[PDB]
Design an enzyme around this catalytic site. Structure first.
Site, mmCIF file in Angstrom:
data_model
loop_
_atom_site.group_PDB
_atom_site.id
_atom_site.type_symbol
_atom_site.label_atom_id
_atom_site.label_comp_id
_atom_site.label_asym_id
_atom_site.label_seq_id
_atom_site.Cartn_x
_atom_site.Cartn_y
_atom_site.Cartn_z
ATOM 1 N N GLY A 167 -47.164 19.186 -139.513
ATOM 2 C CA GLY A 167 -46.732 18.181 -140.488
ATOM 3 C C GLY A 167 -47.507 16.857 -140.465
ATOM 4 O O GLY A 167 -47.799 16.294 -141.512
ATOM 5 N N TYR A 174 -41.936 22.048 -148.632
ATOM 6 C CA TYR A 174 -40.500 21.767 -148.728
ATOM 7 C C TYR A 174 -39.913 22.438 -149.972
ATOM 8 O O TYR A 174 -40.217 22.032 -151.101
ATOM 9 C CB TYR A 174 -40.263 20.253 -148.795
ATOM 10 C CG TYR A 174 -40.583 19.526 -147.513
ATOM 11 C CD1 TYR A 174 -41.888 19.128 -147.214
ATOM 12 C CD2 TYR A 174 -39.580 19.237 -146.596
ATOM 13 C CE1 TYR A 174 -42.179 18.461 -146.027
ATOM 14 C CE2 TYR A 174 -39.853 18.572 -145.412
ATOM 15 C CZ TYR A 174 -41.152 18.185 -145.130
ATOM 16 O OH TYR A 174 -41.394 17.545 -143.941
ATOM 17 N N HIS A 185 -35.960 6.970 -143.336
ATOM 18 C CA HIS A 185 -36.941 6.887 -142.265
ATOM 19 C C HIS A 185 -38.255 6.242 -142.684
ATOM 20 O O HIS A 185 -38.593 6.174 -143.868
ATOM 21 C CB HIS A 185 -37.250 8.274 -141.714
ATOM 22 C CG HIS A 185 -37.894 9.189 -142.707
ATOM 23 N ND1 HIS A 185 -37.218 9.709 -143.792
ATOM 24 C CD2 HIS A 185 -39.155 9.677 -142.781
ATOM 25 C CE1 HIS A 185 -38.032 10.480 -144.487
ATOM 26 N NE2 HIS A 185 -39.212 10.478 -143.895
ATOM 27 N N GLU A 187 -42.366 6.983 -141.449
ATOM 28 C CA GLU A 187 -43.169 8.072 -140.889
ATOM 29 C C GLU A 187 -43.357 7.919 -139.390
ATOM 30 O O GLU A 187 -43.194 6.825 -138.849
ATOM 31 C CB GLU A 187 -44.554 8.113 -141.544
ATOM 32 C CG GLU A 187 -44.551 8.344 -143.049
ATOM 33 C CD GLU A 187 -43.696 9.516 -143.471
ATOM 34 O OE1 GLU A 187 -42.931 9.364 -144.448
ATOM 35 O OE2 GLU A 187 -43.763 10.576 -142.808
ATOM 36 N N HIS A 273 -37.702 5.045 -146.503
ATOM 37 C CA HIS A 273 -37.326 5.791 -147.712
ATOM 38 C C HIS A 273 -36.386 6.965 -147.456
ATOM 39 O O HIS A 273 -36.291 7.473 -146.340
ATOM 40 C CB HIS A 273 -38.569 6.289 -148.440
ATOM 41 C CG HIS A 273 -39.486 7.088 -147.577
ATOM 42 N ND1 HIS A 273 -40.295 6.514 -146.622
ATOM 43 C CD2 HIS A 273 -39.717 8.416 -147.516
ATOM 44 C CE1 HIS A 273 -40.981 7.458 -146.005
ATOM 45 N NE2 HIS A 273 -40.646 8.620 -146.529
ATOM 46 N N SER A 285 -46.460 17.980 -148.274
ATOM 47 C CA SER A 285 -46.755 16.659 -147.719
ATOM 48 C C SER A 285 -47.378 16.645 -146.322
ATOM 49 O O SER A 285 -47.334 17.644 -145.587
ATOM 50 C CB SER A 285 -45.502 15.772 -147.751
ATOM 51 O OG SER A 285 -44.463 16.322 -146.992
HETATM 52 O O1 LIG Z 1 -38.058 16.439 -147.953
HETATM 53 C C1 LIG Z 1 -38.864 15.686 -148.477
HETATM 54 O O2 LIG Z 1 -39.317 15.843 -149.697
HETATM 55 C C2 LIG Z 1 -39.400 14.498 -147.761
HETATM 56 C C3 LIG Z 1 -39.552 13.279 -148.409
HETATM 57 C C4 LIG Z 1 -40.039 12.204 -147.697
HETATM 58 N N1 LIG Z 1 -40.367 12.282 -146.393
HETATM 59 C C5 LIG Z 1 -40.217 13.464 -145.759
HETATM 60 C C6 LIG Z 1 -40.623 13.503 -144.305
HETATM 61 N N2 LIG Z 1 -41.708 12.584 -143.983
HETATM 62 C C7 LIG Z 1 -42.955 12.922 -144.689
HETATM 63 C C8 LIG Z 1 -43.690 14.049 -144.018
HETATM 64 C C9 LIG Z 1 -43.526 15.353 -144.460
HETATM 65 C C10 LIG Z 1 -44.197 16.393 -143.854
HETATM 66 C C11 LIG Z 1 -45.031 16.149 -142.787
HETATM 67 C C12 LIG Z 1 -45.203 14.861 -142.333
HETATM 68 C C13 LIG Z 1 -44.542 13.816 -142.945
HETATM 69 C C14 LIG Z 1 -39.736 14.588 -146.414
HETATM 70 NI NI NI Z 2 -41.332 10.564 -145.208
#
Ligand SMILES: O=C(O)c1ccnc(CNCc2ccccc2)c1
Ligand code: NI
Ligand SMILES: [Zn+2]
Length: 349
Positions: A167, A174, A185, A187, A273, A285
């Site tokens: 990730g 997702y 959170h 990052e 966010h 992502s």
């Molecule tokens: O479920 C979602 O859409 C979602 C929205 C916003 N943030 C996340 C999690 N932090 C980002 C991230 C995702 C993947 C790998 C590394 C960092 C998830």
């Molecule tokens: Ni995020």
């Protein structure tokens, strides 16, 4: 100078041409030159011609190894979210569940109504989220904004130590259904992130400006004193859900925006966010960095209560990009105060 750009710290939306879109790190620098980063979150609509994949017709057989059932407990706009790991399933099995009468999107007119329903029904009929799936849906040959290989300075972690964090420096997919949530959170290491919604129903976001992130943390600490007591950064557990009405009630500034299929969201260092999915969809992502991240990375308060949490060694970054400060930093005497309004130095270009 930078403090008079996007003074409201509101989520901005950008429409790059194909020429502008070709250079990722340059366009991030550009949108920072416009004050996008002050909001903590920004939308980037790619040019109509661009597509990261020919079609999404061949992926029904893709395995979601660790799907999560999201159970939520709370009241008065304050909730804790508990994950129950379920047995692996395919995308087809997930789509049938997601579009079934039990779990599908309720009828509505405007987003405001759907938003009211989300916050009203959050703790009922717990949905299943196909989260944290290693992989990409970008076709091997696509060079513009490829989440698998953005080629930012975050690549110094793999280059130096050999380490891949799933990730973080690799892509995650997702698969959402209605009412699936991502908690409040920043990052890991207060990095940037990039989220692309490949297809399906919208994903809605809330954001707090990085210059008010500390206000949010104080609020969260007041409401969860036990959690605060046992962890220095409990929001990194990604379990805490806070409604926009609670933020408004305690004077925390924030904005909202709904992401649609084929659109990008960028989160910026220390940009808190949260949000939810409208219905069946798929998002990709990962994290990335700029020269401006480094100071955020150095000062990031990390989770203190779990051995298996994401820690990046900042040495390599300080050594290469701040050689004058390295001796001072190692001594524990670097008192650089971050100004959240400044754009990344690459924005000179
Ligand atoms: O479920 C979602 O859409 C979602 C929205 C916003 N943030 C996340 C999690 N932090 C980002 C991230 C995702 C993947 C790998 C590394 C960092 C998830
Ligand atoms: Ni995020
Ligand atoms: Zn912790």
């Amino acid at each position: 100078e930078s403090e008079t750009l996007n003074p409201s710290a509101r989520i901005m939306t950008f429409y790059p041409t194909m020429e502008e879109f070709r250079n990722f790190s340059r366009y991030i620098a550009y949108i920072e030159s416009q004050g996008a980063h002050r909001a903590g979150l920004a939308k980037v609509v790619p040019p109509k011609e661009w597509k990261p994949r020919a079609s999404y017709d061949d992926i029904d057989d893709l395995v979601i190894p660790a799907p999560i059932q999201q159970l939520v407990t709370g009241q008065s706009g304050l909730f804790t979210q508990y994950n129950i790991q379920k047995k692996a399933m395919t995308v087809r099995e997930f789509r049938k569940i997601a579009n079934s009468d039990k779990y599908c999107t309720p009828r509505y007119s405007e987003f405001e109504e759907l938003e009211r329903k989300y916050w009203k029904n959050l703790t009922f009929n717990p949905p299943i989220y196909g989260a944290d799936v290693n992989g990409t849906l970008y076709e091997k040959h696509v060079d513009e904004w490829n989440i698998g290989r953005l080629r930012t300075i975050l690549d110094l972690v793999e280059k130096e130590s050999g380490i891949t964090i799933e990730g973080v420096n690799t892509p995650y997919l997702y698969f959402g259904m209605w009412k699936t949530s991502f908690a409040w959170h920043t990052e890991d290491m207060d990095l940037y992130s990039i989220n692309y919604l490949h297809f399906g129903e919208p994903k809605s976001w809330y954001s707090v400006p990085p210059e008010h992130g500390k206000r949010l943390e104080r609020l969260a600490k007041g409401f969860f004193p036990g959690s605060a007591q046992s962890c220095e950064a409990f929001l990194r557990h990604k379990m805490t859900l806070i409604s926009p009405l609670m933020l408004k009630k305690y004077g925390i500034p924030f904005d909202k925006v709904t992401q649609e299929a084929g659109e990008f969201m960028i989160t910026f260092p220390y940009g808190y966010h949260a949000g939810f999915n409208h219905g069946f969809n798929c998002a990709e992502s990962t994290n990335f960095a700029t020269r401006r991240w480094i100071e955020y990375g150095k000062q990031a308060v990390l989770c203190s209560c779990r051995k298996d949490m994401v820690k990046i060694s900042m040495d390599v970054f300080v050594r290469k990009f701040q050689p004058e400060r390295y001796k001072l930093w190692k001594a524990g005497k670097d008192n650089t105060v971050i100004d959240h309004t400044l754009p990344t130095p690459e924005a000179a270009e």
